[PDB]
Amino acid sequence: NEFYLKTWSEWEKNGTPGEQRNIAFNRLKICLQNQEAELNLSELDLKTLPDLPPQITTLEIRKNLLTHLPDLPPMLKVIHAQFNQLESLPALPETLEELNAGDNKIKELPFLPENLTHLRVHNNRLHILPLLPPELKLLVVSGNRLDSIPPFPDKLEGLALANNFIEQLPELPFSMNRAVLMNNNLTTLPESVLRLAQNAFVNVAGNPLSGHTMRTLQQITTGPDYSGPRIFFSMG
Amino acid sequence: NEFYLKTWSEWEKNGTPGEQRNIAFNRLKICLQNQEAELNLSELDLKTLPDLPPQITTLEIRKNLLTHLPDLPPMLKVIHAQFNQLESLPALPETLEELNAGDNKIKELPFLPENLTHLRVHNNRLHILPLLPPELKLLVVSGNRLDSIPPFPDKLEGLALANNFIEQLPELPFSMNRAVLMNNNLTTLPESVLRLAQNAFVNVAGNPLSGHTMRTLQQITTGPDYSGPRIFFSMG
Numbered sequence: 001n002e003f004y005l006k007t008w009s010e011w012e013k014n015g016t017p018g019e020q021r022n023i024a025f026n027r028l029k030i031c032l033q034n035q036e037a038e039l040n041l042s043e044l045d046l047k048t049l050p051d052l053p054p055q056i057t058t059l060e061i062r063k064n065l066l067t068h069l070p071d072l073p074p075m076l077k078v079i080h081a082q083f084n085q086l087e088s089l090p091a092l093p094e095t096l097e098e099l100n101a102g103d104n105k106i107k108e109l110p111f112l113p114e115n116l117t118h119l120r121v122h123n124n125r126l127h128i129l130p131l132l133p134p135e136l137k138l139l140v141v142s143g144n145r146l147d148s149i150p151p152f153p154d155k156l157e158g159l160a161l162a163n164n165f166i167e168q169l170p171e172l173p174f175s176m177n178r179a180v181l182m183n184n185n186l187t188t189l190p191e192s193v194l195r196l197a198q199n200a201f202v203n204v205a206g207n208p209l210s211g212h213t214m215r216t217l218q219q220i221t222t223g224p225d226y227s228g229p230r231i232f233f234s235m236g
Numbered sequence: 237n238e239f240y241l242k243t244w245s246e247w248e249k250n251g252t253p254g255e256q257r258n259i260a261f262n263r264l265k266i267c268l269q270n271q272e273a274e275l276n277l278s279e280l281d282l283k284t285l286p287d288l289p290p291q292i293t294t295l296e297i298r299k300n301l302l303t304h305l306p307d308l309p310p311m312l313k314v315i316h317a318q319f320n321q322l323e324s325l326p327a328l329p330e331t332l333e334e335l336n337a338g339d340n341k342i343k344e345l346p347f348l349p350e351n352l353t354h355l356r357v358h359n360n361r362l363h364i365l366p367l368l369p370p371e372l373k374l375l376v377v378s379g380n381r382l383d384s385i386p387p388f389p390d391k392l393e394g395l396a397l398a399n400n401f402i403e404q405l406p407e408l409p410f411s412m413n414r415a416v417l418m419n420n421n422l423t424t425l426p427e428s429v430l431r432l433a434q435n436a437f438v439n440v441a442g443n444p445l446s447g448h449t450m451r452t453l454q455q456i457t458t459g460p461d462y463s464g465p466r467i468f469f470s471m472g
Contacts, residue, residue, distance in 0.1 A: 043444055063421060063444070083401065083421075085381075103399055103419070105381075123359070123379050123399055143339075143359045143379050163339055163359055165319065183319075183339075185279075185299060208279055208299070 004032055004051060011050035019065075020044040028053065042080070062100075072096075082120070092116075102140070112136075122160070132156070142180070152176075162206075172196060182206040188213045194220055194228040205234035240268055240287065247286035255301075256280040267292065278316070293331070308332075318356070328352070338376070348372075358396070368392075378416070388412070398442075408432060418442045424449045430456060430464040441470035 008028050015021040024044050031039045031053045038058035041049070046064040051071070058078045061069075066084040072091070078098045081089075086104035092111070098118040106124040112131070118138045126144040132151070138158040146164035154173045160180040167185045171192045177199070183206035193202060194217075209217075220226060248261040260277050267275045267289050274294040277285065282300040287307070294314040297305075302320040312329045315336065322340035328347070334354040342360040348369050358378040365377065367386050374394040382400035390409040396416040403421045407428040413435065419442035429438060445453075456462060 083419075145341075185319075 001032075004053065005029065007051050011048070016047060018045045019047055021046065031056065057095075169193075176200065179203070189217070193231065196229045198227050198229060200229040202229050203232040205232055207233070209233060237268070240289065241265070244286050247284070252283065254281045255283055257282065264289065298336075413437065415439070425453070425467075429467070432465045434463060434465055436465040438465050439468045441468055443469070445469065 008025055012021055012025045024041055024046060027039065027041060035055050037056060038060065039053060039056045040060040042060050042062045042064065044064055046066060048068070049061065049066060049070050052059070052073050054073045055075060056073055057075050059076055060080045062080050063083045067087055069081065069086070069090055072079070072093050074093045075095055076093045077095055079096065080100045081104070082100045082102040084104050086101060086106055088106060088108065089101065089110050092099070092113050094113050095115060096113050097115055099116060100120040102120050102122040102124070104124050106121065106126060108128065109121065109126065109130050112119070112133045114133050115135060116133045117135050119136065120138070120140040122140050122142040122144070124144050126141065126146055128148070129141065129146065129150050132139070132153045134153050134155070136153050136156055139156060140160040141164065142160050142162040144164055146161065146166055148168065149161070149166055149170055151170045152159070152173055155175050156173055157175055158178040159176060161184065162180050162182040164184050169181065169186060169190050171190045172179060174196065176196060179200070179202045181204045186204060186207040187210045189204065196202065217231065221228065221231070244261050244264050248257045251257040260280050260282060263275065263277060266272070271291055273292060274296060275289060275292045276296040278296050278298045278300065280300060282302060285297070285302060285306050288295070288309050290309045291311065292309055293311050295308070295312055296316045298316045299319040303323055305317065305322070305326050308326055308329050310329050311331050313331055314334045315332065318336045318338040318340070320340050322337060322342050324342060324344065325337060325346050328335070328349050330349050331351060332349050333351055335352065336356040338356055338358040338360065340360050342357065342362065344362065344364060345357070345366050348355070348366050350369050351371060352369050353371050353373040355372060355374065356376045358376050358380070360380050362377060362380040362382055364384070365382065365386055368375065368389050370389050370391070372389050372392055375392060376396040377400065378396050378398040380400050382397065382402055384404070385397070385402060385406055387406050388395070388409055391411050392409055393411050394414040395412055397420065398416050398418040400420050405417065405422060405426050407426045408415060410431065413433060415436065415438045417440045422440065422443040423446045425440065425445070432438065453467065457464070457467070
């Protein structure tokens with residue numbers, strides 16, 4: 001309890017000129033004393049964070065200059081860390097449900113915990129993704145360096161992978177209603193794309209789909225009973 | 237010239253298994269012998285390029301695995317090098333008019349030559365831009381690490397700098413009709429935004445514009461003779 005005030009007071013003082021660590025100390029202490037659910041340190045030019053209040057369920061720290069996070073409290077449900085300079089993340093609490101860390105410099109994600117439902121991590125430097133947890137509903141990984149993709153869990157609804165280097169797409173679960181796959185290196189599509197719901201959104205423009213893929217898809221989608229989705233794509 | 241056929245022939249032999257350097261050697265051979273304007277080595281899994289045929293005016297090499305480019309021939313007008321692993325670019329030929337190098341790892345650009353009209357470099361790692369040349373017409377630098385922007389040349393028509401860390405935007409020239417400025421760190425807007433043409437597109441959603449900026453902009457834009465453009469933005 002006073003462990004935090006000692007830690008925070010010393011972190012108060014150890015800052016470069018622009019960091020608004022003076023406001024940060026105030027928000028940290030109040031957050032501890034009133035046992036608040038959310039800690040909001042966004043837009044404070046912070047280059048580091050100290051140890052965090054243990055009871056919080058929302059950590060909002062977007063638009064700072066963080067290179068690393070401290071250990072994450074075990075009750076966190078939502079973490080918004082987008083627009084920092086994060087190079088990695090610490091271990092994620094088992095309670096984590098929503099993680100936004102887009103627009104950082106993260107080269108690898110840590111193990112993804114079982115309750116994660118929304119992962120938004122575009123504009124990083126990911127070459128690989130860890131295995132996806134069973135409740136994942138939304139996955140946004142556009143604008144990274146992804147060469148390959150782990151298999152999809154069977155509740156995934158939204159998938160955004162534009163502007164990567166994916167060569168092969170794993171099978172798409174019937175739960176998927178939004179598949180944004182532009183500007184990759186796909187030459188073929190998984191058969192399961194055609195088995196999605198009729199109103200599903202599918203965009204594979206900007207991929208070098210082979211001639212056989214194109215003729216295959218043209219024969220099926222123009223069949224008189226075709227019930228699959230509309231597929232957007234491009235040539236040239 | 238037998239100088240190129242030897243060099244290309246020995247570059248052909250020196251590849252790892254997946255690189256399709258045999259198809260590339262043939263395209264090089266055809267390009268040299270028929271004196272073609274365009275050399276197209278895109279989508280061949282290439283990790284390096286050899287010396288290039290000197291007469292080409294279009295270099296098409298997107299979607300390979302290149303880390304460095306070779307010296308560029310002196311009549312190049314168009315270079316499409318997006319989706320590689322570029323670390324940097326070589327010195328740019330004086331004739332260069334269009335450069336696309338998005339989705340690489342480029343940390344800084346070289347000197348930009350005087351005839352460049354189109355620069356598309358989104359999804360790289362730029363912290364700074366070089367000074368912009370006087371004919372620049374289109375500038376796309378979305379998805380980088382930009383903290384600042386050099387002054388804008390006065391024929392610039394399209395500007396896309398979404399998803400960077402820019403805190404102050406330089407003045408916008410009257411020629412600009414498309415200003416895509418979302419998800420940065422602006423708290424205010426330059427005066428010159430209000431002097432753009434009435435049909436210009438301006439999008440600053442996702443910036444933490446101050447309350448004073450918002451109330452000022454609301455007073456001006458709702459006056460009965462407001463002559464400027466529509467501005468899109470966001471709150472929350």
